[PDB]
Amino acid sequence: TELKGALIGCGFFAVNQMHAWKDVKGAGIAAICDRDPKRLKLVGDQFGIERRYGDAAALFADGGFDFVDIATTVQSHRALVEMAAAHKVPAICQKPFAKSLSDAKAMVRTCENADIPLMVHENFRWQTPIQAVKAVLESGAIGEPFWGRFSFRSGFDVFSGQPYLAEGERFIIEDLGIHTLDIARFILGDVATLTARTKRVNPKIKGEDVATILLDHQNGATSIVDVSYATKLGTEPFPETLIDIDGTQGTIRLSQGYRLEVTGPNGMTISDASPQLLSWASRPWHNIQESVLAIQQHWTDRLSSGGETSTSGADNLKTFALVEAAYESAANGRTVDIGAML
Amino acid sequence: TELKGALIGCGFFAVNQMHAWKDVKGAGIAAICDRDPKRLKLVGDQFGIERRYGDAAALFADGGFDFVDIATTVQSHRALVEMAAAHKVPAICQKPFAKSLSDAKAMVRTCENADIPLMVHENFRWQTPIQAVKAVLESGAIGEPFWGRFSFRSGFDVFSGQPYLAEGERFIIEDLGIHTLDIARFILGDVATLTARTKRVNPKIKGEDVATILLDHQNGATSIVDVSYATKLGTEPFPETLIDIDGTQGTIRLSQGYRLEVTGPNGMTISDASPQLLSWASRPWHNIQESVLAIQQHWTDRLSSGGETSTSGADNLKTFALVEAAYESAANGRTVDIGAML
Ligand SMILES: NC(=O)c1ccc[n+]([C@@H]2O[C@H](COP(=O)([O-])OP(=O)(O)OC[C@H]3O[C@@H](n4cnc5c(N)ncnc54)[C@H](O)[C@@H]3O)[C@@H](O)[C@H]2O)c1
Ligand SMILES: NC(=O)c1ccc[n+]([C@@H]2O[C@H](COP(=O)([O-])OP(=O)(O)OC[C@H]3O[C@@H](n4cnc5c(N)ncnc54)[C@H](O)[C@@H]3O)[C@@H](O)[C@H]2O)c1
Ligand SMILES: CC(C)(O)[C@H](O)C(=O)O
Numbered sequence: 001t002e003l004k005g006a007l008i009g010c011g012f013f014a015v016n017q018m019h020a021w022k023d024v025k026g027a028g029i030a031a032i033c034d035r036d037p038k039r040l041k042l043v044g045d046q047f048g049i050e051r052r053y054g055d056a057a058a059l060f061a062d063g064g065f066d067f068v069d070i071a072t073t074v075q076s077h078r079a080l081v082e083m084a085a086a087h088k089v090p091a092i093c094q095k096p097f098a099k100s101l102s103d104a105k106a107m108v109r110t111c112e113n114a115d116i117p118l119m120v121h122e123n124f125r126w127q128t129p130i131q132a133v134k135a136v137l138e139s140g141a142i143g144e145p146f147w148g149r150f151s152f153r154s155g156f157d158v159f160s161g162q163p164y165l166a167e168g169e170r171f172i173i174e175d176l177g178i179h180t181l182d183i184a185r186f187i188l189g190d191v192a193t194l195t196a197r198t199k200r201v202n203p204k205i206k207g208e209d210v211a212t213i214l215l216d217h218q219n220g221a222t223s224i225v226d227v228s229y230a231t232k233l234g235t236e237p238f239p240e241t242l243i244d245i246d247g248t249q250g251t252i253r254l255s256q257g258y259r260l261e262v263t264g265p266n267g268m269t270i271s272d273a274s275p276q277l278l279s280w281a282s283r284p285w286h287n288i289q290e291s292v293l294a295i296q297q298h299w300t301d302r303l304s305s306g307g308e309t310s311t312s313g314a315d316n317l318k319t320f321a322l323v324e325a326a327y328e329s330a331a332n333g334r335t336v337d338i339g340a341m342l
Numbered sequence: 343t344e345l346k347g348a349l350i351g352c353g354f355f356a357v358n359q360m361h362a363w364k365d366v367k368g369a370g371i372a373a374i375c376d377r378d379p380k381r382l383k384l385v386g387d388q389f390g391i392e393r394r395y396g397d398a399a400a401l402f403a404d405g406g407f408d409f410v411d412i413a414t415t416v417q418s419h420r421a422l423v424e425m426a427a428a429h430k431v432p433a434i435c436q437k438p439f440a441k442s443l444s445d446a447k448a449m450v451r452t453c454e455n456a457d458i459p460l461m462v463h464e465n466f467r468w469q470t471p472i473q474a475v476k477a478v479l480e481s482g483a484i485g486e487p488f489w490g491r492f493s494f495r496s497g498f499d500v501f502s503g504q505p506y507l508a509e510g511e512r513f514i515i516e517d518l519g520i521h522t523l524d525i526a527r528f529i530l531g532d533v534a535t536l537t538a539r540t541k542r543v544n545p546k547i548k549g550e551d552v553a554t555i556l557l558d559h560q561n562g563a564t565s566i567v568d569v570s571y572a573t574k575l576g577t578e579p580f581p582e583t584l585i586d587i588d589g590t591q592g593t594i595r596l597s598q599g600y601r602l603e604v605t606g607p608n609g610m611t612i613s614d615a616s617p618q619l620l621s622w623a624s625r626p627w628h629n630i631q632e633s634v635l636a637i638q639q640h641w642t643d644r645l646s647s648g649g650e651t652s653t654s655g656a657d658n659l660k661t662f663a664l665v666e667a668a669y670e671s672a673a674n675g676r677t678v679d680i681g682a683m684l
């Protein structure tokens with residue numbers, strides 16, 4: 001049977017989510033919503049969507065959908081999730097989850113009280129290369145992991161497609177580090193303590209565009225999360241996340257161009273962990289775009305079976321707390337206890 | 343007209359220093375000293391040295407040398423440098439400089455009061471690839487540096503050539519990280535604050551074999567110093583230090599195999615930054631062995647010109663403070679102020 005979705009926020013990234021919902025087996029978009037009638041019209045016509053709302057309140061009043069997909073900017077996330085919980089509509093919410101850890105917890109609390117699933121659309125861990133790093137480590141190929149590096153250093157002009165990124169006092173950790181930190185948790189488990197440093201290099205923005213974060217994982221592992229939008233390389237890696245993992249019996253090295261090198265007791269293997277190229281995908285976004293389909297299918301599968309999602313609201317709190325801790329650490333110059341925040 | 347040197351400590355690394363002394367123009371070794379008569383004979387015969395001593399006191403009593411090269415283990419460093427100062431003999435001392443920052447400071451003050459040059463033999467910054475990274479950065483090719491990584495991750499059995507490294511409670515930071523931290527200072531300047539984590543992976547050693555360090559440089563830059571002797575790769579990089587620098591106008595990437603990539607406003611260049619393999623050198627140590635010639639020739643030039651050496655006693659205090667601070671940080675879990683130690 002065929003699940004019916006409403007997408008709220010028909011913006012730049014929502015277009016990818018709409019393409020992917022078409023591709024998803026067992027779900028489709030029955031209605032869309034946007035405050036901007038130019039976007040409502042553009043996306044409605046492109047994807048052949050008849051039901052079109054100028055405000056979310058009216059969309060929820062009319063009903064007719066089994067889940068909601070919140071692709072708006074952060075300012076409206078809490079309100080829209082709360083509206084979803086009040087109407088008992090299962091909700092997907094884009095990152096950043098909320099404006100603070102408090103708002104995030106209240107959002108998780110409200111959805112639990114209404115007994116509806118809540119998933120954060122956190123798609124970086126759903127990329128094919130990141131899945132492959134996880135599979136290799138889980139298999140036992142390199143023994144117990146003790147050290148990692150998770151790197152996203154770019155000079156790509158993200159500000160064209162996403163103008164708001166140049167305007168906030170907070171930029172790179174909230175926008176991108178949120179993903180890289182999620183990957184660190186996904187691969188090496190939850191974090192106990194964290195230390196962070198930030199810098200603004202680009203003179204045309206208001207926010208920090210370089211962040212370096214040292215993680216002490218609960219399992220004993222140390223990792224480095226380093227992110228930059230001021231790194232000028234001869235070959236632009238956007239939007240590849242590069243990963244080094246050292247274990248007691250081996251190494252994983254995910255390097256640029258999706259090359260995956262695994263050394264264990266048996267010896268070295270090299271694999272191509274490149275993503276697929278979907279019909280609607282576009283270089284260099286294709287890795288992210290594939291991961292949109294993966295996470296949207298995952299949601300659809302879990303909604304049908306009754307299980308929890310991988311980047312559930314509850315789980316995402318442990319990612320989001322690292323974002324808020326990194327800002328705190330960067331300002332105070334202090335190591336921050338994550339356990340105490342949650 | 344050559345400067346006549348005396349070498350104290352005819353151990354395994356001293357062989358490299360003796361070879362290089364032969365190559366150095368304007369200096370040579372006239373006497374040697376070792377407490378072990380087997381080593382005194384081996385090195386004496388190999389290099390054709392007539393004057394041979396069983397103790398440094400008798401050596402300094404007889405005199406007849408212009409400088410002293412101390413290649414003993416750390417225990418006798420303070421005593422030998424003090425003997426040198428009291429006999430007004432310019433002194434080179436192997437790393438680690440001393441057992442504590444306190445001893446090193448007193449060693450520096452004694453040489454300053456005796457009006458004699460004191461160089462620490464700290465040779466990693468004299469490696470051809472590392473000099474190449476310095477030169478590129480100073481040229482302004484990548485603008486002002488804001489971020490760096492300095493990385494030495496090996497699975498190499500250093501314990502055969504140097505069995506004392508397996509014995510002590512302190513291992514990788516004191517032995518290897520001392521170099522990596524010195525390089526970080528050389529490239530990005532002095533450090534204000536420091537945070538460090540350590541781990542023992544290898545079951546068959548007493549000390550820590552993994553260390554990850556975060557540096558806040560006085561000039562505003564942030565760097566990562568990560569060192570490991572428990573890293574099992576498909577190609578062994580021992581003993582290469584891999585360096586990434588990001589600047590306002592470009593990047594530097596010194597990668598495995600002495601590959602030096604520089605991206606700036608005029609495109610990207612790729613060059614070979616590998617060492618000259620000297621007649622007496624031997625792979626893969628030829629990197630370290632060339633730097634022995636470079637630093638000893640440097641000493642000899644500065645002893646003639648009367649200028650301060652690059653890794654002088656006074657300079658090396660600012661590297662040694664970082665080793666001490668890193669052990670402290672790793673035990674405390676706290677960030678350490680470097681300026682308050684000096
Ligand atoms: N990898 C990823 O998953 C990924 C990639 C890019 C962006 N994002 C995230 O997606 C979100 C949206 O990013 P974007 O670049 O598409 O922004 P955008 O500004 O292009 O789109 C937001 C849209 O939502 C509408 N909107 C805002 N508030 C609303 C409300 N209360 N009701 C109805 N409509 C509303 C706006 O009119 C706009 O069209 C952001 O939170 C961003 O962090 C995620
Ligand atoms: N890249 C480098 O610069 C590099 C490389 C290896 C070792 N080292 C350093 O060089 C030093 C020596 O290392 P090694 O591996 O050659 O050690 P080693 O044990 O081979 O050599 C030390 C020698 O000094 C002698 N000795 C000790 N105390 C003495 C005293 N009071 N008087 C006279 N002789 C004495 C010993 O008999 C021994 O032969 C160490 O401090 C080490 O940290 C530096
Ligand atoms: C990769 C980008 C540009 O930071 C995007 O905002 C994202 O969150 O995926």
Ligand SMILES: CC(C)(O)[C@H](O)C(=O)O
Nearest residue numbers: 500504517518521581630
């Ligand atoms: C770190 C090494 C290679 O073991 C050696 O002691 C050195 O200082 O070069």
Ligand SMILES: [Mg+2]
Nearest residue numbers: 021022024027
């Ligand atoms: Mg579908």
Ligand SMILES: [Mg+2]
Nearest residue numbers: 363364366369
């Ligand atoms: Mg000579």
